């Protein structure tokens, strides 16, 4: 019962201890910068042939 009560305490932390405010938005901003980089690379690949 004590080991399971300890797991519940550790479980509350694991959920809301490693939890950080604004996570999905930061991932979307990282994706946007990669999309712009790929867009610049395809333009450079268009300029090579042309």
């Amino acid at each position: 019962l004590e080991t399971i009560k300890k797991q519940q305490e550790l479980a509350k932390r694991q959920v809301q201890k490693d939890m950080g405010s604004q996570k999905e938005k930061w991932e979307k901003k990282k994706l946007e910068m990669i999309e712009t980089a790929e867009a610049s690379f395809h333009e450079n690949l268009a300029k090579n042939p042309v």
């Binding site: 994706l31 990669i34 999309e35 980089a37 790929e38 867009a39 690379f41 395809h42």
Partner: peptide
């Protein structure tokens, strides 16, 4: 999974 979205964005521009 992060690199896939831009790999798709390149295909669209193609």
């Amino acid at each position: 999974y992060e690199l896939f979205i831009p790999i798709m964005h390149t295909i669209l521009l193609i």
